[PDB]
Design an enzyme around this catalytic site. Sequence first.
Site, PDB file in Angstrom:
ATOM      1  N   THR A   6      -1.778   6.307 -11.109  1.00 30.13           N
ATOM      2  CA  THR A   6      -0.341   6.218 -11.440  1.00 30.13           C
ATOM      3  C   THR A   6      -0.118   5.006 -12.292  1.00 30.13           C
ATOM      4  O   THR A   6      -0.986   4.153 -12.267  1.00 30.13           O
ATOM      5  CB  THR A   6       0.501   6.161 -10.166  1.00 30.13           C
ATOM      6  OG1 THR A   6       0.076   5.018  -9.434  1.00 30.13           O
ATOM      7  CG2 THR A   6       0.320   7.360  -9.252  1.00 30.13           C
ATOM      8  N   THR A   7       0.943   4.966 -13.096  1.00 26.99           N
ATOM      9  CA  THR A   7       1.345   3.778 -13.867  1.00 26.99           C
ATOM     10  C   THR A   7       2.840   3.749 -13.898  1.00 26.99           C
ATOM     11  O   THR A   7       3.396   4.674 -14.482  1.00 26.99           O
ATOM     12  CB  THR A   7       0.808   3.745 -15.288  1.00 26.99           C
ATOM     13  OG1 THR A   7      -0.603   3.858 -15.159  1.00 26.99           O
ATOM     14  CG2 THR A   7       1.170   2.453 -15.996  1.00 26.99           C
ATOM     15  N   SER A  39      -2.765   2.600 -10.499  1.00 26.52           N
ATOM     16  CA  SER A  39      -4.159   2.400 -10.878  1.00 26.52           C
ATOM     17  C   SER A  39      -4.272   1.815 -12.281  1.00 26.52           C
ATOM     18  O   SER A  39      -5.171   1.009 -12.549  1.00 26.52           O
ATOM     19  CB  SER A  39      -4.920   3.720 -10.778  1.00 26.52           C
ATOM     20  OG  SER A  39      -4.442   4.657 -11.726  1.00 26.52           O
TER      21      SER A  39
END
Lengths: 228, 225, 226, 228, 211, 225, 212, 230, 213
Positions: free
Chosen positions: E1-2, E130
């Site tokens: 995810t960002t 991540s």
Amino acid sequence: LYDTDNIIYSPEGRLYQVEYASEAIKQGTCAVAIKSKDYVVVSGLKKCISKLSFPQEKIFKIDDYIGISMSGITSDAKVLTKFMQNECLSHKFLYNENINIESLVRSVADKYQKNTQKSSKRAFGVGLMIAAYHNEPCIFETRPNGSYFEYDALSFGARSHASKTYLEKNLHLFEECSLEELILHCLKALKCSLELTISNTALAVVGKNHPWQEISSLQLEEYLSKVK
Amino acid sequence: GYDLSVSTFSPDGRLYQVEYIYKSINNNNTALCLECKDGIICCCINSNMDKNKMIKKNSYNRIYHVNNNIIITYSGFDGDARNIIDRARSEANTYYYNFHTNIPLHILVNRISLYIHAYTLYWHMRPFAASIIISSFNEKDKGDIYCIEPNGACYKYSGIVIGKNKEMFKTEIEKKDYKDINVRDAIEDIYKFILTLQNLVNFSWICKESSYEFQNIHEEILTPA
Amino acid sequence: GVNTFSPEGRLFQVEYALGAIKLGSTAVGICVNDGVILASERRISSTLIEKDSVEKLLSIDDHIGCAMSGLMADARTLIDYARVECNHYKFIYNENINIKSCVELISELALDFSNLSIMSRPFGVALLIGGVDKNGPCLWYTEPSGTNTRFSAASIGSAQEGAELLLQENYKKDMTFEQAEILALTVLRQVMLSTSNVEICAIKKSDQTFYKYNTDDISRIIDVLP
Amino acid sequence: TLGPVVTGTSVIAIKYKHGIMIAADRKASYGSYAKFQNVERIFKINNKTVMGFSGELADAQYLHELLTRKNINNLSEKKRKEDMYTPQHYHSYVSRVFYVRKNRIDPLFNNIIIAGINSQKYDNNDDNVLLYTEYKEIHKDDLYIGFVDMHGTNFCDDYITTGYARYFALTLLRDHYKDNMTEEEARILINECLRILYFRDATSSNFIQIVKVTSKGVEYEEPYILPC
Amino acid sequence: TTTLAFKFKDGIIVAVDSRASMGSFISSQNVEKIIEINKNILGTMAGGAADCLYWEKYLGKIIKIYELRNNEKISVRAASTILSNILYQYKGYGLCCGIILSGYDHTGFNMFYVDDSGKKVEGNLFSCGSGSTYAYSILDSAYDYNLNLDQAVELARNAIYHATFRDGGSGGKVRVFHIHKNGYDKIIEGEDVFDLHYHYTNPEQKDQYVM
Amino acid sequence: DRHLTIFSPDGNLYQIEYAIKAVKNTNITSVGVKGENCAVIISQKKMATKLLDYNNITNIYNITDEIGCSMVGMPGDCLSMVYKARSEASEFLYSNGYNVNAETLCRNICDKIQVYTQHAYMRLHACSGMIIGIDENNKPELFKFDPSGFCAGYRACVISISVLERLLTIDEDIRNTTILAIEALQTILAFDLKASEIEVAIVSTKNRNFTQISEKEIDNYLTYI
Amino acid sequence: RWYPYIDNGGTVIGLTGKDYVILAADTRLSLSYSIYTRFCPKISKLTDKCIIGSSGMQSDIKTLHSLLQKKIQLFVLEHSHYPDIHVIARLLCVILYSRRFFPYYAFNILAGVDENNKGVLYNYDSVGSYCEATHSCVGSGSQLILPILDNRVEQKNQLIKNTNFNLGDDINFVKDAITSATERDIYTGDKTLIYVIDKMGINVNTLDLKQD
Amino acid sequence: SYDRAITVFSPDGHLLQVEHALEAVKKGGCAVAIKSSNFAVLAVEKKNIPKLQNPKEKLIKLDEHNCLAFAGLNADARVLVNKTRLECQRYYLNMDEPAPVDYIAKYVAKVQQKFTHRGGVRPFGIATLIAGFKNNKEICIYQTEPSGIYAAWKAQAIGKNAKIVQEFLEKNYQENMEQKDCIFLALKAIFEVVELSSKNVEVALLTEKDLTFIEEQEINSMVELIDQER
Amino acid sequence: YSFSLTTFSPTGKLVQIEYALNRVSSSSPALGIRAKNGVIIATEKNELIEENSIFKIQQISEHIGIVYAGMPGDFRVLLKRARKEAIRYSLQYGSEILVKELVKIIASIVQEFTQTGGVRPFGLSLLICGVDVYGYHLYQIDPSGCYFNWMATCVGKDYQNNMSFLEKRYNKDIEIEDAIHTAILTLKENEKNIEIGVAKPFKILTQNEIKDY
Ligand SMILES: CCONC(=O)N1CCC[C@H](C(=O)N[C@@H](C)c2nc(-c3ccc(C#N)cc3)cs2)C1
């Protein structure tokens, strides 16, 4: 002195608080219920305090083939309606079959009389008329003093004596009469209790291959026209 | 002013609530149990609801059973009686939980009489308004009949009547000795005493014809009697 | 005894609590197809009281409002309970509660003192709860006895009978929302007029949103009295 | 139970023309030791319901006593023959028991079969139920056989095998089973399945008990030795 | 995810991806990670999706009940404190939540980072997931307070693109929201990173891009 | 107000007096007599106050094989106190692994009765009790308590006092103690007693177990006098 | 120790059009290289316009479906109306999250047609994380079917498009998808049930597949 | 009476214990609160035997910014104040912001209603005047009755002879006013009922920074000015 | 249902304590006398009742004995509680319990029933005698729960006259034998009526021992 608390027996051997709860049933509006070899029809008067007020709901659903009418204090009736609905749905969740009406009525009567022993609690000021088709049509009366009774026909509430007299006159015809004839008999008994406007009369049916269902407004108007 | 609580003795040493419960039970419907040579015959007369013609025919039954071979009947309020009957069933189930055998009748009588007695002690509980006839029959022991009074007492009989009109029914059933009479020959006399119609009566027995197990009279044996 | 019955079958404490709901400032609620409106009288006893602090009308939810009379602190407890339960429903189901269901929750808490299945006495309050749901606008009256009643229009407070008579004499089903506004102002005027004398709230079918009136809105309907 | 010690082996059950036939060998093994060889492994719940198990014996006895007391509880609240609980109700009860025990990580180390007759229309056996003392062709839809697992997963089929019979007897049943099979055909098929199980299963035995649930109730045939 | 939030001259920018991959397998590339907690505060999902969704909706109901009781919009600080205390109550149970709460209140524009382990940190440039390190690299390289709205929007889009490009667990679409005084706006509701790659790094599209 | 178990202005507790009156109102008499190596209780076999089973009526009870008792008063309270005594003896045996004494059991039972004596919310048991048993020194023990919750050991007691005072080998001692108990009850009641309406129970060093002599032996003892 | 979880296998595919939803599911039940039974349905009916299918442990699936049906029936008895697919979706999310620290081993697809006559599919993991989708798949075969659905439904790697989708073509496509699932998945097989909800109610069709 | 209803509805419709608590409140000493632009002044009567009783407390600093002045039963006031302080710090722990005056006035009113409704408890025989600052930095004063109802006031009085001081405050409050004028107004208002002396009152000014008590010399000078005026 | 039966009178009196005081006043007498080298407590009281089973004087611990005036059952429960508290102190601190600490604990327990809801006060007054490192101790506990430290005292019927007699007779420096003689003299105002307990360890004097005195 003998009616200050619900646990004291009178010198005659009577519980005055429970009898006052049973006397609270008579203040409710009239309801009638009849059956035959197949069907059960329950009718009642929806209370309307003023023309701006909508009529008060009088009949409630419990299960696909069970419904109730009440007479007395409405909060008690709502509590017991919730109890019966949760009992039926819990039986339907735990086991994959319909609950027995005998067991459910026994449970509701036990729930009534549990409150008439402890001095902290009070009796249920509401009488119940449970109509259903489990394996055959059936009508059950439940009174505040813990007792319940089967009935071929039943009625109670304000001015219910005239409807009871009509039922006493016409009980022998209900078994063989058809469904529409049975609806006309129930509506005539309800009229005899008293004007049957579309708003002020509730009516519902349950029977063989017929879940609990309130009759629609147009059908109710047709039946009320047929009452004469 | 000593009678307004079960947890207080009057200056005479009496609990008046128990006496008022006795009066209430005596005002209620009649119930007989009788000990015949081949079985015990029990019955109830629901004549207080004779005015109510809307009742479904032969539905209000005051006769119940425990473990299929212990009749239990009552005279009093219905809800209190159902508490007592459900407690008796629960005690029998607990005895089968522990020991894998049916409970003896007298131990059940003692347990349920103690359960009834427990409510006559505290000031915050209503004492039981019910007199309970619990009975069973066996090929070897013949008929055991016990009457539990509302005061927690329990007494063994060879025949008992509770409820209204108990004196007349007692002196009527006392006339002949039923240890040499069968149940079929006794139902006729029971109907004769009930007369002194047929949809306000309940019956049951545990004789050999039912294989010593609970039953009710079929209409074809009711009618010719 | 709090739970004792009367020989007439009526609970003593509920009958006594019904006497409390008469006392209070008068309020009125009107339901039409366009929306629902609740107007209420203010009791400005003296100039030292901050007017906006005391509020007879308020929100139970974003789509529900209420006009309350009786013992005000009991009403504050009831509306707090209703707000918590309504937001719990909106969390658990991701929609808006029906006004009937919220009214039934409020009525279920009302007779908690009886302990049929914790409060100690009945509530001493009556509520006209209005709002818009999927079934349209509606307005429900509830009282200490635990009974609910759907109303086309209703009034609560001290001058209940006069406001009820005026509503019965001068209410029509198909009337415009502005028509219902002037009806509410006329009823309250006859019961007792300027901005901050009466507080008005509305929930419209188009918006389904609570909207408390303010300056230039109270005066607008005051300027069109007959 | 923390794990099995005295273990019972497989059970086989099929439907046939007149009812249910359920077979189990009468051996209980204490590890790899035939400590008991006269163990009753099929239990009579009521006149139209029987149970069988494969797994730990203590857990099976506990479940059997639970269902027994449930049967007397049902009988105590009986008024007519239709009030009796069918095999569906007992199957649902056992499934809920196993599921609740599975939630706590404390299972009954057993696989259970519940079998019998659903409908009451084929006889009046339960008009006067007695506990202490030609056939009718029953439709397949009115019969019931149901499997319950340690994890609580459950189902129904025309023929259920539990234990090591799920590999050896299930193949022969899926090949040779047919509807409306006669009693003799069912008997020889079950005997062949048990012969293969006895030859290929160490824990099995050649001392069989057959129970028939038919229109005249539950019938325990006298135990016998499998020839060869 | 960002997920990557950051204060700037006109307000706050928030930006997220849309994947919900189960280990190696991509389960769905159309997930909404910017949960609207209320009309001014915005949520942000990282780590465990179930926990983030449930507890951000729970914070939403708590804030709604508080605002209805007290009749005033809550602050970013108070919402962050409530969320951090609720998450710390479940210490030792295995929750996985990384949340960035940005918003406007009477104190001004406020941004906070909250964690399942009870963390609560006040800042002006945050990133989680991540691919958080790559977005941090791009943002801290290019961030300036006096950027316009469009400049900040393209900066956030570029940072999310680079995070998805380097990180195996980020990609799908990019959603970029803008928070101002009167509410917030969805400047980019959704946009494939395929076009972002073939616009930013490989516009010629004549051969495979060598990393 | 004498309703609660609280102090009257003269300091008396009238509920205990009323419970003692309740016990006396039953018109049931039981005589306990100790001996050199034995103890007897003789009680009157009648209901507390035709088809009734008169064999079932009894006041004596078996708390344990060694210890036994006779309760007089309300029947439900008598049975409840019997069950309390059995529970007390069983708890003692479980915790300590040896049989409780008659003395210690009476101490604990009166400790239980004191709770009802002191607490307003508890009714008092209209029950007097007379326990017998042999101790570990091989000597008899006769203890007696009343609804007040006060126990005492007696050489002989009744539940009249002067009639026992003037009257007051193991086989001969047992015979003489039984004759003394029977003659004391006969003199107190002042009418000739049939063997089918009285009940004798004996503990002795010869037979440690509580046991009641048959009606034939009581008839023999009555014809002896 | 005893591990309180098993995988009963099978697969459940879900697709939606503009005005309809299709939900296919196999009816095989398998412990581990064995077959309990050849007919154990996975899809259940909630209302007249909503269904739930699921794959995982069968006891968890059955108890969850029965509990959810019970809750919807209580909702109808209390609130006097039938819940939309979104209401049932949030309810299912809360129910699954209630066991967050010992989860239902069940992956679910909730299919329905909403108030606006728009097909809606909500896919659900074990611990209540959920989202809307046009197509979804759960169970053993899902990693096979999902690339196929991504290729056909939302073609991204194709330069020229063809989105002439209709009910019959979608039914044939789902039949081909479950057929390809049966070929390359050991735990998928036996009969399969296909439920269709477009505008009026539920229509159920059945299709035999490879029995191996 | 562990769980019993001490307060119940009367035949007319009143909760008699609430009016009895109000009667108890009427015995308490007079306490006056006046507002201004960004500060308040609370002045409360004190009664103590001279030469024996330690002068050292009807006013309280509840938290960083709130303050309280009660009238009624003193022990009930002390326990209610301790609960209020606990809730102030609980809010400041659970939100990381100081408790507004509106929130804590609502909490005190809620607690008073709760003791007016729960079984086995007695109503609080105390009325309260809280003064403090809101989230938007404005100052205000909340008066709370024993009956659980609260309300905000520009200026208000509680305690014995509250009506006379209230109707005096009505004709003299003049919106924003200086600190000297506000304190002098409070002195002449509360002195319309209590005897004209310097030692019969304690007065404190609440500002955003802290609650400052006015020294006895200033109070004595203002009392001399009041005596010269009349 | 937990409400105090003992309540303040309009004249600021707990009348239930007064009525328990009346009850113990109506009970048979007991007394205690403290010597320089001993402490004594003595009692006063059918031909069928056993004298062995009705001892009013009882032993709490090796150097603590107890006598009462009032109800027997109340005395038995309080004696059990006193023995339990003495055993608790012996198990905790090792040494035998001090007289003062036991008296304080029993006084607190007696006062608790004066205030606990749904119970009445104890209908007796106790006298603890004992010996420890701080000498000999005699302590009287009332129904009110107040403990009084005495040199010599009398409780029960006619206690004022017996107090007057003992006050005329008592001296601080008396012996055990002289104290026993004075106790018997006070009780005179037969062999089987009197029973005496003296505290060396606490002991009950057998019937012949009272006979020779
Ligand atoms: C025994 C169970 O059999 N094995 C199984 O079913 N598997 C494992 C292999 C990948 C499958 C998969 O990924 N299926 C897609 C359609 C799904 N997506 C979701 C989902 C839920 C929430 C969000 C969010 N926010 C995103 C995606 C739930 S299922 C799911």
